[PDB]
Amino acid sequence: SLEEMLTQAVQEADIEQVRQLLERGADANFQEEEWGWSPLHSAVQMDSEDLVALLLKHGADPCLRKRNGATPFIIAGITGNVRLLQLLLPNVEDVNECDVNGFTAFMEAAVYGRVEALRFLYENGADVNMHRKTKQDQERIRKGGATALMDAAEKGHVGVVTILLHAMKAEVDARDNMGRNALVYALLNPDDGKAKAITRLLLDHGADVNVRGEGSKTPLILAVERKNLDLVQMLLEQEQIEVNDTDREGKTALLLAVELRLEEIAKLLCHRGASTNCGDLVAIARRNYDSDLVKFLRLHKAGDFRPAENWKPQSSRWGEALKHLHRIWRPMIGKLKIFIDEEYKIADTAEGGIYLGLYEDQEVAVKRFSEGSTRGQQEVSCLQSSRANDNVVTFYGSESDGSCLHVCLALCEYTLQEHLANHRGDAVPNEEDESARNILSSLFKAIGELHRSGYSHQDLQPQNILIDSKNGTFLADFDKSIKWAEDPQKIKRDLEALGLLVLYVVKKGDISFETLKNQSFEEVIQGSPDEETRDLIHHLFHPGEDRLSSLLAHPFFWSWESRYRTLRDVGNESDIKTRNQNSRILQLLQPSELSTSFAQWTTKIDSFVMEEMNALYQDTLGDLLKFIRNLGEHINEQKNKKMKSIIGEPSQYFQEKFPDLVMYVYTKLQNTEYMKHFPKT
Amino acid sequence: LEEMLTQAVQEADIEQVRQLLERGADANFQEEEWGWSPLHSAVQMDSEDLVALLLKHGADPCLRKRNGATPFIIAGITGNVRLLQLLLPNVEDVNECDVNGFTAFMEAAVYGRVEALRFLYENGADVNMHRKTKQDQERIRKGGATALMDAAEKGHVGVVTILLHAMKAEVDARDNMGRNALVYALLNPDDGKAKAITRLLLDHGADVNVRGEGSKTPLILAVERKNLDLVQMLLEQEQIEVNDTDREGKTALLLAVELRLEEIAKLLCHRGASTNCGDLVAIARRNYDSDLVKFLRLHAGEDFPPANWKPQSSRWGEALKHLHRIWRPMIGKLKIFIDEEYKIADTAEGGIYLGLYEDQEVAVKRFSEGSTRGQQEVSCLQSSRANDNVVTFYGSESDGSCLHVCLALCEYTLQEHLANHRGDAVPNEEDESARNILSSLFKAIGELHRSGYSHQDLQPQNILIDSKNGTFLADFDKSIKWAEDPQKIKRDLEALGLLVLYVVKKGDISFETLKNQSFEEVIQGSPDEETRDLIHHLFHPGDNVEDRLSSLLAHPFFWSWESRYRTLRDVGNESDIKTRNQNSRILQLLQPGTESTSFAQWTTKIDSFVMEEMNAYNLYQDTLGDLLKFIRNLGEHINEQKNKKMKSIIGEPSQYFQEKFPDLVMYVYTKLQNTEYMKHFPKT
Ligand SMILES: Nc1ncnc2c1ncn2[C@@H]1O[C@H](COP(=O)(O)O[C@@H]2[C@H](O)[C@@H](COP(=O)(O)O[C@@H]3[C@H](O)[C@@H](COP(=O)(O)O)O[C@H]3n3cnc4c(N)ncnc43)O[C@H]2n2cnc3c(N)ncnc32)[C@@H](O)[C@H]1O
Ligand SMILES: Nc1ncnc2c1ncn2[C@@H]1O[C@H](COP(=O)(O)O[C@@H]2[C@H](O)[C@@H](COP(=O)(O)O[C@@H]3[C@H](O)[C@@H](COP(=O)(O)O)O[C@H]3n3cnc4c(N)ncnc43)O[C@H]2n2cnc3c(N)ncnc32)[C@@H](O)[C@H]1O
Ligand SMILES: CCN(CC)CCNC(=O)c1c(C)[nH]c(/C=C2\C(=O)Nc3ccc(F)cc32)c1C
Ligand SMILES: CCN(CC)CCNC(=O)c1c(C)[nH]c(/C=C2\C(=O)Nc3ccc(F)cc32)c1C
C-alpha cells in the first residue's frame, strides 16, 4: 500500500504527496511485477521534471530495467524533453544502452521524431549507425538490425531524416538482418509528400535501389502498388535500376501497372525498358476497359507472348468446373478466388448459396452470408470451435468483401441423400447393412463432440450431412446452431433429429426425411425394421449430456457376428450349462416383462435340429443361450452337415427367428459383470 | 477459321473486316467463353469506324454477352457520345440493365464520363435507379446502389455535383445494405476528393447517422482514415451521434485514443463525447501520448473493465489466461507476445509460442518470411487438412518480417508423454497405449504419402499428444513432395521402424541410441515376435511400396491379446483339427512334411496337472494341430466349476500361451495369411 500510494501519487502528479512518502521511506526502485515499471520510468513517460528531480534525489536508479529491458533514460528519448536527458546522463553508464529488442535512446528519439533530443544525444556519444541487437530467437528468423535512419524513414519524419544524413553522418545503405535498407522503409509510409521527400534525400546519398523488401518486392514494385507516378519517376532516374525484377509470385512492375489500370506509370515503364513478355498485358488492359493503353501496348508488339496448365483438382464431381475456375482471371477477396456464376454453384441456401472457390490455391465450398447476418456469425463461431472435431467439415477461414461474409469449407463429393441414391443398387436386399453403422457412428461422434464443445446444431437433416471421396461423413451448415448453455433442453432437437436420421439411413434413403418429420414418435418406432433400431431411436427421444458416446456401445452398432459371438459367450457360462437356478447370471436373466419371442422357443425351431441337439432343452432363456453356444461349437462338424443346411448362416438364423433376443440380453446384462461378454465397443 | 478470324477486329484494321464481312462469318458470332461479339469488342476499343461497318451488317445492338451486356451499356463505359448516337435508335429502353443491375448511365457514373452522362439524362435515363440483381445476390443484401453512390465511391467530384444539382439525384438513397453515398464517399483512397464529395452530400442533407461495413458510422470511418478535416466536417452537423459504436463496441473516441490521434481525440471530447467508453487514460499512456494523457486526466476513465474466457489446455492454461488478459496488437487474426512465459519450445527457426487465433488457443511456429522451410511447412499443412492425425492447421499470418504458422495446441510431446505414463502398466500386462499411438502414426504417414508428401524427419519430438491422448504428427519444415524422388518414402518408413521399438520400449531406449544402431540390432532389440516381424516389414518395405502402411495395420502386432487367443481358439475349432485329419486343407497349411519352433514337443512344456486333466478323451500329440485343439478345449472349459485348479495354474490363458510359446501367433498368422482361413483373424 505504501509504494502503491507512491505509484498512484506519481500517476496523479501530486508533487507534495510524493515528497512525504519518499521521506516516509517508500522505495523509488519498486517495480510492479507485471511490466516492470518504476516510479522513475513513469515520471519520465508523463513528462513532469519536478517528479524526476525529486526521485533522483532519493536514489532512484536511472539504469533500472522494466520488462522490455528499457531504462528511464531510454524512455526520455521517446519523451523528447532535453532537461530530463540532462538530469539522467551523470548516472548513465553507457548512453548506447539497449532494451531487449536492441532499442537505444537515440533510436527512440528517431522513432518519435524528437529533433532536439536527437541533437543532445548526438553531441554525447550516441552511435548513429547502431543496428538493433536482439535476442537469439528474433535473430534466428532474421529479425532486428535496423537503424535510426530506417526508423525515421518508416515513420516519415522528414526533419529527422534531413538531420541524420547531413549533420550526423548516417550510413544510407546500412542493412537490417532481413537485407532491407531505409529506402524500403521509406516507401511503406502512408503519406505522399513525406514519402516523396525522404526518397529524394536517400536516393541522392546513394541508397541501393536493387533491394528486396517484404514479399521479395523491390522499391519499384512498391512505388507501382502505391499508385504514385512521383515515386516512380525518382526511381527510374537511375540507370542501374533493374526494371525487369520479379517479386514473390513472378509479377513484374509493369505487369502490376497494367493490372492496376495506371496509364502514365505503364507508359513511362515501357519507355524505360520494361520488357513486354511477362504476361498478356494487352488482354489485361482490355478487361480493364483501358482503350488508350491497349493501342500503346499493340504499338510495341514483339511478334504475341504466350503463357503450361499444371494444377489438377482433387474432386471428381467438381473437377472440370474447378479447372475452369483456376484457368480464368478473377480478383481476390483476401485468400479467396470466387465467381458468382451458375457453372460454379454447388447448391442453394436460405441466404447466398454455396459456390466453388479456391482458397490459397486449394479447392473449397464457399457459403455466403450478408456480413451483418446473425446467421453467418453463428456459423463462423461454431466452425472456429470445431477445428478438433474430426467429423465436422474442415474450415479454411472466412473472408469479407465488405458487403459479404464468405465462409470457406472443405469441398465434399455428395450430400448424404445423394450418396444413398448412388449406392442404393449395391446390396442384395437382405444383406447386413455395415454402411449404415459407419455413417451413423460418424454422426454420433460428430454430434457428441459438438455438444462437448458447447454447441448444438438445431437443423440436423440429410442435406446438412456430407460424404467425401473416401466415404467419410461430415456434419455441416451451422447457421442455426446455438451455444446450448443458453437453453440446455434444446439439445433434445439434435437428439430427435438423430433418431429420425437413424431410420432414414437404415431405410437406405427410401423414406424421405420430410415424410419422417411429419410422423409422430410411435409411427417412427413402428416404421423401424428391427428391435435394435427401435430401442436405439427410443433412447434418442428419451435421453438421460454425454449420452451419445455411450450409445455407440448399443447393439445396433454390433455386427451380426459380434451379436452371435456375444450370445455364444453368454451361453458358455458355467451356471447356464449346469442350469444353476441359484446363480447370479440366471437371476439377472429371470423376469414384470411382456411376452417374448423366445418363450417356448423349442416349438419354433425345426424339429430335426431339435432332436439332433437333444442328443432336456427347456423353454428358458438360459437354455436358448446354451442352445446357441452348442450349435455354434458343433455346426461345422461332419455329423451335422444336414443340420447346417437347415440353419444356413447361424447369426442370421437366431436373430430372424427371435428378433428380441440380442436386445433382451443386452438389457439384462448391461450394467453387470457379464457386460464383459459384449464386443469391444 | 470462320468465326475465329475476328481478331482483325483485335488488330482493328477496317480492311480485313469489310473484306471478310462478305467472305463468310456471322456478325453476331459470340465467342463461347464470355459472349464477346465483334460489335461488343469494337465499342470497347472505341473505334468509331468499326461500329459503323458492323451496324451496316445487321449486328444487333441489344445483343447480350455473359454478364447481360449490350454494346450500348458498354458505350456508357467508353464514354464517347457518337457511339451512343449511332446506337440509341435501335434499343427499346435506355435504362436496360445487365445481370448485376448496371444501366449505361451507371457505367457513365462509374467511369466519370461527364459528356455521356448529360446525353443519357435528357434522353430519358434514370437517376434514382437502384441496382436490381439476381436473387442470390439479393438474399445476402447486395445491390441497390444508385449512380450517386457509384460516383462518390470512385471519387468523381465532377459527376456528383452534376447529379446533385442538374439531375435531381436523391442524396439519402440507401442500397440494400442500408448505406448512402456518404458511406461510399468516406471509403475513397483520395483525401481531397473525399472531402469535396462529403461536403456536397452533407449539405444536400445525407444522413450522418448511417451504418456501413462492420456497423461503422461515418464518424468512425473518418477517425480510422486518420483525417481531422472529415472529422470536423462531420462534427459540423448538430444531429450527429458521437457515442455511436461499431460491431466490436468501440466508440469513435476510443478509436482516436487507440490510434494516437491527440487532435481528433481532443476535438471529439470538446463536442460532447463520453470519456467512459474504455480506460482511455491507460490507452494514451501505453501509446506514450503524454499531452493527451494530461488532457483526458484534466477532464478521465473513472466511471469505467470487462472480465470469463477459460482455456481448454491444462498444461498451458495459466499462461493462456495471462495472454488473454494483456493488451497486444493483432498480426491479422493472431494475438502473440514474444516472452519466456509464453514459450512452448525452441526451434532451428524462431521457436514455438502460445498464441490466440480468432480467440482460439494455438501453438505458433515462427519463420522468417523469406524461409524455404516456412514455405515447405505451410504447403504441406495446406495439403493435410483432411489428415486427421496431423496437427490442425489454423492459418498463417505475416508481420512483414515474419511468417507465423498457427497450430492446434497439444499437451505433450511423445517423449514427455511416455515419461509421465511410464508407471501406469504393471510391467507384466498388455500395452494398449503403444498400439493406439503407433496405429495413429501409420494412419498419419499413410495419408501424408497419399497427399504426395513425405516427412523426412520422423522422431519423437515431432509427435504430439493432446488432452484426450490422440497422437498427432507435426513439423513439416523438412518435408518434400515425393513424386520427384520416389524412394525417399523409404526413409519415413525406416523412421517408423525406429518409432515402433521406441514406443514398445516405453521410451527407455533413446531415439538417438536407436538411430545409430543398424537394421539388425534394432530387430534384435525387439521384446517379441510381433514387434520383430512388424519392424522387419518397415525396414524392408519393397520398391513396389505403395500402401504398405495400410496393410500393416492388419498385422498381429495390432491385435489385442484377447483377439490373438480368440483366433487360436477359432482355428482350433476346425473340424479337421478335431478329427486330426492329416490329409485336410487346414493341416496341410499348418504342418506339412517331416519341427526349431518353441511349440515342438509342446506337451512336455506345460504343467503336468493341466496336461493330465486335459487328457479326458488318442492322447494329445506334439503337432501344432493338437496345440490349437488344446487351446480351443481349454478356452471352452477353463471356467467350468470342476476346473478351478487348472484356472489358477494358467491364470489369464491369452497371456499364458503367448508366454510359453512366443512364436505361436506369428506362425499361425504366416500360415493362414492369404488363405480362406484368414476369416478367423480379428476385424480392423
Ligand atoms: N474482346 C475480348 N476477346 C476475348 N476475351 C475478352 C474480350 N474482352 C473481355 N474478355 C474477357 O472477359 C472477362 C471478363 O468479362 P467481362 O469483361 O465481359 O465482364 C465482367 C465480368 O466477367 C463480370 C464479373 O462481375 P463480378 O462477378 O466480379 O461482380 C461485380 C460486383 O460484385 C457487382 C457490383 O455490384 P454492387 O454490389 O456494387 O451493387 O457487379 C460486378 N460489377 C462490379 N463493378 C461493376 C461495373 N462497374 N459494371 C457492371 N458490373 C460490375 O462482370 C463484368 N465486370 C466486372 N467488373 C466490371 C467493371 N468494373 N465495370 C464493368 N463490368 C465489369 C475478362 O477476364 C477477359 O478475359
Ligand atoms: N507508466 C506505466 N506504468 C505501469 N504500466 C505501464 C505504464 N505504461 C505502460 N504500461 C503498460 O506496460 C505494457 C508494456 O508496455 P511497454 O511500453 O513497457 O512495453 C512494450 C512491449 O511490452 C514491448 C515488446 O513489444 P513487442 O513485442 O510488440 O515488440 C515490438 C517489436 O516487435 C520489437 C522489435 O521491433 P523491430 O526491431 O522489428 O522494429 O520491439 C517492439 N517495439 C516496436 N517498436 C518499438 C519502440 N519504438 N521502442 C521499444 N520497442 C519497440 O516493448 C514495448 N513497446 C512496444 N512498442 C513500442 C513502441 N512503439 N514504443 C516504445 N515501446 C514499445 C503496456 O502495454 C501498458 O499496459
Ligand atoms: C441430387 C439432386 N439434388 C436435389 C435433392 C440437387 C443437387 N443439390 C443438392 O442436393 C445439394 C444441397 C442441398 N447441398 C449440397 C452441397 C453442400 C451443402 O449443403 N453444404 C455444403 C458444404 C460443403 C460442401 F463441399 C458441399 C455442401 C448439394 C450438392
Ligand atoms: C521439460 C518440459 N518443459 C516444461 C516443464 C518444456 C520444454 N519443452 C519441450 O520439451 C517441447 C518441445 C521440444 N516441443 C514441444 C511442443 C511442440 C513442437 O515441438 N512442435 C509443436 C507443434 C504444435 C504444438 F502444439 C506443440 C508443439 C514442447 C512442449
Task: Produce the secondary structure layout.
Two copies of one chain form a homodimer.
Chain A: H1 2-12, H2 15-24, H3 39-46, H4 49-57, H5 72-79, H6 82-88, H7 105-111, H8 115-122, H9 136-140, H10 148-155, H11 158-165, H12 182-187, H13 192-204, H14 219-225, H15 229-235, H16 253-259, H17 263-270, H18 281-287, H19 291-298, H20 319-327, E1 332-333, E2 336-338, E3 345-347, E4 354-359, E5 362-370, H21 374-384, E6 395-400, E7 404-410, E8 414-415, H22 416-422, H23 434-452, E9 455-456, E10 465-467, E11 473-475, E12 482-483, H24 491-506, H25 513-518, H26 521-527, H27 531-541, H28 547-551, H29 560-570, H30 574-577, H31 584-588, H32 607-614, H33 621-634, H34 641-647, H35 650-657, H36 661-669
Bound molecules: 5'-O-monophosphoryladenylyl(2'->5')adenylyl(2'->5')adenosine (2 copies) and the ligand CCN(CC)CCNC(=O)c1c(C)[nH]c(/C=C2\C(=O)Nc3ccc(F)cc32)c1C (2 copies).
One copy of the ligand CCN(CC)CCNC(=O)c1c(C)[nH]c(/C=C2\C(=O)Nc3ccc(F)cc32)c1C is lined by residues 344-345, 352, 363, 391, 407, 409-410, 413, 461, 464, 474-475 of chain B.
